[PDB]
Write a protein that binds this ligand. Structure first.
Ligand SMILES: COc1cc2ncc(-c3ccccn3)n2cc1-c1cnn(C)c1
Ligand SMILES: [Cl-]
Ligand SMILES: [Cl-]
Ligand SMILES: [Cl-]
Length: 310
């Protein structure tokens, strides 16, 4: 039956073809105890989001960043059933995130509570929420004012975050604006929000046996062969660029997810230039949607092309 899995995954390449890799599993690796934080020092707030397996909650953490100082954090946890398989899925995400290291454009792990109670993973709080809702909130406030350089900066930062994950040998299997968070200074951060989401919350995911597939964000090789590489993420990134430069419009607007959608993608269908994009930004998008993954740009390339335009 269906299990919890972070959409952030470490991988190891075993050859030079796209399907020659496997997924790194931390279940047999040991958890580093220097990350352990006392549960007594967490004061819980609202539910940020709730899924089938668990939820993410706002909280106040005493002494996590500096001595004597309370800050706001976000806490992943399981729901009370506490099935032991789901427990280890969440330990594996913990161990994985402890090995990543931090980066400005990733929602970083701060600590965890694992010994005297139910498992908590503790993350940086991002006050303005997911990028998708943020962009949508600012449709009637675009020149609280949102400008074109802000949009370009968001694009640059997400690419920067993905460069980090590439260099650390990770992929994100669900890169989209709903999984990017916004915080002070127009700063954006890639996260894995999957534990806080359901099938009721989202029609952008298609049920298919065990899988829950974000079809309109997926590269052809992901859709047709089940392959997720960093070049798949470049496709997804293109789709996320379209989201940014339309202020959060659903991709392939008005087109439903069905067998005809699979055919569109197979035959080379690509979205049009959205309102807030320049022609140069649309040329970037279009090359992210190269059918052949070798023709797509890399995240170092995109970090340059968008370092320039700023
Ligand atoms: C205030 O909104 C947030 C703030 C926030 N800060 C951290 C996180 C988070 C989410 C997942 C994993 C790790 N961290 N987080 C999530 C949200 C959030 C809640 N709902 N939506 C749509 C975004
Ligand atoms: Cl996710
Ligand atoms: Cl959501
Ligand atoms: Cl989902």
């Amino acid at each position: 039956q269906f299990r919890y899995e972070s959409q952030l995954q470490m991988v190891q390449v075993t050859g030079s073809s796209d399907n020659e890799y496997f997924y790194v599993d931390f279940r047999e690796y040991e958890y580093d105890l220097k990350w352990e934080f006392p549960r007594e020092n967490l004061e819980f707030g609202k539910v940020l989001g709730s899924g089938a397996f668990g939820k993410v909650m706002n909280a106040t953490a005493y002494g996590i960043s500096k001595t004597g100082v309370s800050i706001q954090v976000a806490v992943k946890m399981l729901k009370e059933k506490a099935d032991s398989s789901e427990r280890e899925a969440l330990m594996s995400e913990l161990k994985m995130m402890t090995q990543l290291g931090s980066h400005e454009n990733i929602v970083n792990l701060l600590g965890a509570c694992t010994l005297s109670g139910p498992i908590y993973l503790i993350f940086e709080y991002c006050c303005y929420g997911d990028l998708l809702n943020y962009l949508r909130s600012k449709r009637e406030k675009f020149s609280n004012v949102l400008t074109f350089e802000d949009l370009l900066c968001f694009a640059y930062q997400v690419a920067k975050g993905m460069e980090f994950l590439e260099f650390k040998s990770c992929v994100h299997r669900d890169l989209a604006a709903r999984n990017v968070l916004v915080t002070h200074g127009k700063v954006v951060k890639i996260c894995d929000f999957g534990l806080a989401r359901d099938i009721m919350s989202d029609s952008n995911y298609v049920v298919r046996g065990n899988a829950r597939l974000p079809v309109k964000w997926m590269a052809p090789e992901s859709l047709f062969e089940g392959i997720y590489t960093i070049k798949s993420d470049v496709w997804s990134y293109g789709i996320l660029l379209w989201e940014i430069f339309s202020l959060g419009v659903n991709p392939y607007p008005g087109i439903p997810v069905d067998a005809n959608f699979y055919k569109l993608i197979q035959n080379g269908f690509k979205m049009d230039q959205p309102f807030y994009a320049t022609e140069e930004i649309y040329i970037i998008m279009q090359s992210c949607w190269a059918f052949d993954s070798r023709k797509r740009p890399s995240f170092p390339n995109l970090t340059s092309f968008l370092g320039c335009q700023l």
